Subunit: 98 residues, 6 copies
């Protein structure tokens, strides 16, 4: 996890621990694999305005799971349809710079 | 219907919407099912219950996407978007 | 609205400022009220509150004689800026209005 | 918790349990009391479009904590300033009907 | 934009439909392009993406000769529909533009 | 400044914004501090980092609201709004 979660670990250890368990359970799908769920997470975050959140989801996916920029771009096609040009173009620019 | 009126009244707009849809869902590497699961996650992260119900229903009917698959998407909605979105979407799923 | 009827009854200072806010917002330096009301439609149509969308559209048509095709021109912008879910919800609302 | 959470209890017991722990920890503030936090929760939910979520937060607050409609109305004043007339008027109407 | 330059290079079919979408959206049945572009400003100003806001405003001023007071009339509507945070962010963007 | 320009260019608008603010924060029963904590929660549930940082800074400076109090608000943001909003706001808080 990123800087935000390290602050939580420092400030509120028990809350941190419950968040980690939540995260680990969320990403233990019954049918969908972790890669698919992380692609979904990218889509959701990219549909909103948090540029740093978008960069971090994309970076972690590529680093941790080996997700490609081509796979991310396919996620962004869905962002365009669901969410419009502003979200799409912002996300595409972030992907390009990664 | 709804798009049925767009087709009749605004044929150019309708034609470009059909093409936008078709092109979006012609992925370079991810398949259509994966893209539709992403679409469900995005819509479920918001408050439009109709979009959510419609998105889920179409996915199940058109693609054979399962309720368990949808629930796996909703897990991600909880983490990204919080309890209200998650519990609303789970209630919707249960009625399908 | 029902919301505003009770605000007027129960919270007269808040109601007073709300009316004045509305009046001042819609007293543009350059843009006319029709243009501003079309902008308002676009903004609420870009979001998920069906009631707000139906109310902005219905008041526009009633107050200003705005047509469904004019509202649809607004919804074109909603599609581009906001995506298919917002567009399709708002277009169904418009059609049924 | 409401119908959504009962579905989660039925479908995913371990996920349900982690959510309950998260909830209980979130509402164990270090300084702010539970009433204050629930008023904040009303504000946040009311700032968005989920009418059912708004009705449920308000109902539970009034039932569980004895929060008044006058206190909720003061929350909604802040919703107006932060979020605009649509959110304010929708929330006020829901409060009125409660 | 940078986003669109790479889409054009890498994804020509998607780029093609995006351009056509834009062109069709901004070919209104009744409303003119200026009105539609003001609506677009209002919608993106109601949300949190500063880049989109700066881009819509800058293109409006450049393409259409839209003035800061005209944009401010849009922002009046943003305040009413969307609240102080959106209004103040967008007004600062406008002022600095 | 930003509102400083509004004051000069659009005096009626400015005057009504000041009154809206003042009236909103004249609660019938809740105090100003409680209302400002609510405001922090609402803004933090969204993506505008500047609004969040400004809201927190003003609250601490104007009202003596503490970082621990702000963190208690952010707990509610996590539950209502998810991890991204929570972790972003915690990162902002840490720098204040």
């Amino acid at each position: 996890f990123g800087e935000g979660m390290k602050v939580v670990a420092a400030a509120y250890p028990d809350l941190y621990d419950i968040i980690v368990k939540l995260n680990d359970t969320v990403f233990t799908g019954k049918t969908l694999d972790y890669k698919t769920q992380k692609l979904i997470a990218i889509g959701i975050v990219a549909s909103r305005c948090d540029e740093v959140a978008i960069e971090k989801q994309m970076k972690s996916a590529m680093k941790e799971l080996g997700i490609t920029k081509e796979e991310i771009a396919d996620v962004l096609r869905v962002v365009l349809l669901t969410s419009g040009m502003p979200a799409f173009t912002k996300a595409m620019k972030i992907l390009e710079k990664l």
